[PDB]
């Protein structure tokens, strides 16, 4: 039915009114940052290794402890109801059926106990309140509800300019709401009281400078997510993808480094590991079959995508994400 | 109304007569240079830092002893009154009520005097003229006047071939004067009259070669505009952007390095501060504003700069501008 | 009647069913890979020699120990009766007349006896079977009917997804048999066998990491073909030729370096010796000569590929194809 | 009437038989080197330099003893009468009338005793012909006749496949004869026989490696024309642009350094110059006046190239073409 995540996003186009499907694809600005991270994906080319065996090709990886069936993620994505009536919920149960981490937002339409309890091991994305009680609360009910880690999202002091939200007039409709709920920029400061206030691991998503990589392993993040949010953010930040080798560089294993922004196939996947990332985050095109197919549309995505990381792993001669990861690569052009 | 600059280009290209339109956004011989400062500035990607204090989030800078409300300040654009009635006139009136400096042209069709008038603490750009005795005149005007800065522009020993002026036969309307008067090549012979004539900071408009940066600053110059002229002078010039980074390493702190060419964004007034710039000019987006809604279509543009400015600098972490210009930058591909 | 082989392809486009074609035509993937093979000839210029002695101009090459009149071979192309009922045999007699080894697939087909009885000298290609001693034994077939090289196919562990096959519900034919049958992924412990049960020389195809050509001379190879397949196995695998400068160098003349991928012309045969290949492998445009016109299709093909190569050489300088690998190249841009 | 070169080339599409504009406008092969000479002259930037004295600014050079108005040549390009009925005496007239050197080829379709008759001071362009004495009486020819310089072409050992012109069935027509007659290629040991026989400086055309420029030096030769023969012979030939910089410093000040091939514009020749050239030749731009207008087209181009020269020259700050050798570059994008 699809061979490609290409074919799904046509799919999603003709289901979604066009302001919900503007509101999924697009970045800020001039939308720079959003066609940089295509571009930085298609411009790296992988050095496959030969002659290998290949008997036990597993594309499993152990993360913040537990085993995950891919080295991908869920991306956190708010307001999952826009695209599907099921929502969040449709998208976490795909999720936990696939063997991949499912990240709950802080601005889901369904209430984060309601997703946890879907199993599946889920994680918490974290977005700082107001004033500090209100945004420890919100790690503590996550941690009751069973999340495994607290994502906090450090790229995001406001909003940025999504320029074709302004053009349609897009507001969130009046059946689609903050579920958490009957904001304030994070600091260095704040990092350091959800560190103190839970013993899961803390994972920064958006750092993008190799200093605030030194500086969250000295924070004592578990983890961080390599990420200009999607393009979404500051028009004109760097991609992800290409900070993460100097990024890995200077970690020196001290945590896992993800990335994303543009992951669109199995071989975006390997080249991601051959940049050294532990994993990466996957965001529109789950949501493009949400959209299509609600959780049947996303495990057979989710299945898709296992296909193909499997298949690019092995004809590169990778029988592990490990081996994956000590790829080289070579810049082409265009 | 507005939501980026590309629509208003657009409502200034139906307000204005064609070859109007062409004389304000054409270049010299095949517009290389016009074209490759846009190039310039979209290669550029900024790497943005994140969880810092944002309190206090300011884009004023201080040049030439006195406060501006951004790092930005109108460029000399001649024969404003080819846009609208009010020419000059509404576009310094909405550049004081933005709080940022306006540069009164020679060739401006309102004269200076009464430009400087309209409050609002303008510059004043100085061509070279026929002998020296009447451009040193003009520096005296401009400074009775009250002017603060002589933007002196070395960069038109003549004027560039405007091919798109010569396929329209196009020619200064009579209702267009030149509202200073009743022209020869500058050296740095010029430039030592001019420095002796005024107690005002002089800075040359057009250096684009690192070693006429130093020699601007041994000149006394209180600063330099690295500018191509927005592509209007020699096609081929390399743009302002691109030497930007080398001039303020030569410059080394001795004198204001500001940049114009190509700015767009708020974005490229961040990306043009963490290439080290103290300010840019914009040139032809004030007057697409002034040709679609006069003094309110200016001060309309200047607001929404300066909130895209206050936006980007906020993304990338800078509570100020000195902030800015410590970020890292990182070349694109297209 | 024709000119370039850009025009041979138009004429297979209309021969041929649209399913073949594009079986013929297509990558894996996104086809990353199967542009990046023709981008990466293109990017290479040749800095030609001028004034020398012409006398002589030869483009014959020694490899294995025969004379071939090009450095240049047919690639191995499964099924070839897709293309043309005569199949195989229409294309190694067009083969052996022009004085070009024909490399016989191990799905070939026509079986690989009535293939070699044509003459010639050619090739075989060894895919690794199931178990060893069906391989071994696919290896005594070629060389007790003279085959004179083993051309072992290693970067196929399974097939790369090609989606223009998926998206046609694309299947062999009944008409088109494995002519040779009445799979598993080979490793360096294959190859130890294969190399043990033949005298003939081995030649690894696919190899494209500069330590596997490494490896390859240590195995004991006669040669390697450093080949992303022609971009349909791994989708984002880097361009045979732009590892080709490097893998030669480590191979320090250790054994043959052929390399294969877009060759489309003299030129290109020129630029893959200047970067130090052996000799090439040419797979499309035969089969689109093989469609076009059958045997006297390739033999045409082969003749023009012969006379752009001498017309190559000769505007370069080169007497010798010795003395085009001792040309410079320069890349370029696009 | 005409503003840039391009609107000429136009004229001349409309005036021209298909396949006369063809034999004019092809390249070789792919025409691959003809893209990549305007590729070459497009990314290259001027860093211009300001406030210099202009007083004397001219574009005057000398080269072999005589003076010239610009640093420029019209390069040799056969059957001018293809063009127009006058032909090579169009051309070398208007060429006289500018001050600007001609290159007579030795496939004139006007004798070259005719064509130097014109007056102008003319250079000789050589092709080596079967036997060593035809070809030495034809640089006697071509010294009697007051011919100033040999211009040895070395890159013609045969012509360059030109498809353009077999997809014509392009032949000479009858009316064009090669009339300084009633061919083989040369060495190292043709020019030595052709410096022997002339006092005249001997030019080595279609120079592109360093080490053929070090060897023309050595040779005797007065100068060398780095080019790639228009994109004519050796399709995938480096274009001479890119060359230059290496070659002028090799070189070394041992000869003359012209460079042909895109040339189009001033700023072309200013590029040129920047990069270290003595002089360009330009050749299709010339024919493209010859068929529109004839010698008064051809005198119009060479006043408008004259402007444009000194325009970019003065704009760039060069009061001498030995300034503006004295520049510097940057190589841009696309
Ligand atoms: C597409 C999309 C991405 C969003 C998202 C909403 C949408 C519709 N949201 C939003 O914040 C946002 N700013 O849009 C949000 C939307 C509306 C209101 C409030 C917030 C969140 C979020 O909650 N918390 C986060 O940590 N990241 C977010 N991302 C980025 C995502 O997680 C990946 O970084 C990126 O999508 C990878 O790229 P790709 O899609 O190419 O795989
Ligand atoms: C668009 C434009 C730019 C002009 C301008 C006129 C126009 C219609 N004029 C003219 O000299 C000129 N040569 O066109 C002029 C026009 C007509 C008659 C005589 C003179 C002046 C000028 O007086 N004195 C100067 O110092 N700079 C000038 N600029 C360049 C501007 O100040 C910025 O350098 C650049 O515009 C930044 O680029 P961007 O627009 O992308 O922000
Ligand atoms: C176009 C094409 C290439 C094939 C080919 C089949 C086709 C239709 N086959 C297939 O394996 C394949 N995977 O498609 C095959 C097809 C169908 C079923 C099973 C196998 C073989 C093969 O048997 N054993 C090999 O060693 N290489 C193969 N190549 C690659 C070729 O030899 C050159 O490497 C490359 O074509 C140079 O590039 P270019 O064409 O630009 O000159
Ligand atoms: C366009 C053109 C260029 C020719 C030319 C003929 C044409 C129609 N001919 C031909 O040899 C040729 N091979 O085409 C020729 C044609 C037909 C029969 C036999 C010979 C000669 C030639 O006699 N002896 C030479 O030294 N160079 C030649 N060029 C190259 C020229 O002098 C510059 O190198 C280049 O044109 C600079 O580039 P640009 O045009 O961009 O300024």
């Known amino acids: 039915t699809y061979v490609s995540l290409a074919d799904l996003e046509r799919a999603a186009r003709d289901v979604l009114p066009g302001e919900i499907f503007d509101f999924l694809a697009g970045g800020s600005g001039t939308e720079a940052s959003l066609v940089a991270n295509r571009t930085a994906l298609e411009r790296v080319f992988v050095i496959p290794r030969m002659l290998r065996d290949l008997t036990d090709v597993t594309t499993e990886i152990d993360i913040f402890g537990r085993r995950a069936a891919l080295p991908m993620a869920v991306a956190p994505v708010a307001y999952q109801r826009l695209f599907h009536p099921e929502g969040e919920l449709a998208v976490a149960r795909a999720a936990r059926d696939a063997g991949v981490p499912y990240t709950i937002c802080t601005l ?8 946890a309890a879907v199993g599946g ?11 500090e009680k209100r945004s420890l ?3 503590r009910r996550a941690e009751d509800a069973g999340c495994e880690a607290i994502v906090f999202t450090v790229d995001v002091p406001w909003m940025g300019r999504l320029l074709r939200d302004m053009r349609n007039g897009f507001a969130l409709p009046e059946w689609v709401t903050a579920a958490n709920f009957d904001f304030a920029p994070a600091t260095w400061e704040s ?7 839970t013993d899961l691991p803390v994972v920064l998503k958006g750092i993008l400078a190799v200093e605030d990589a030194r500086r969250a392993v000295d924070a004592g993040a578990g983890g961080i997510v390599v990420s200009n949010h999607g393009g979404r953010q500051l028009d004109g930040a760097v991609p992800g993808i290409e900070m993460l080798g100097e990024i890995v560089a200077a970690v020196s294993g001290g945590c896992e480094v993800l990335v994303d922004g543009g992951i669109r196939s199995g071989g975006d996947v390997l080249k991601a590991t051959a940049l050294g990332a532990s994993a990466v985050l996957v965001g529109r095109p789950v949501m493009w079959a949400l959209a299509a197919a609600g959780q049947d549309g996303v495990r057979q995505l989710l299945e898709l995508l296992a296909e193909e990381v499997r298949d690019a792993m092995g004809l590169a001669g990778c029988e592990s994400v490990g081996a994956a990861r000590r790829l080289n690569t070579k810049l082409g052009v265009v």
Not at 121 to 131: G, S
Not at 191 to 197: D, I, N, P, S
């Open 108 to 115: 889901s339409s369904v209430s984060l106990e309601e997703i």
């Open 121 to 131: 091991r889920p994680w918490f994305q974290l977005y700082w309140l107001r004033d």
């Open 137 to 139: 609360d919100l790690v």
């Open 191 to 197: 990092v350091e009281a959800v560190r103190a206030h």
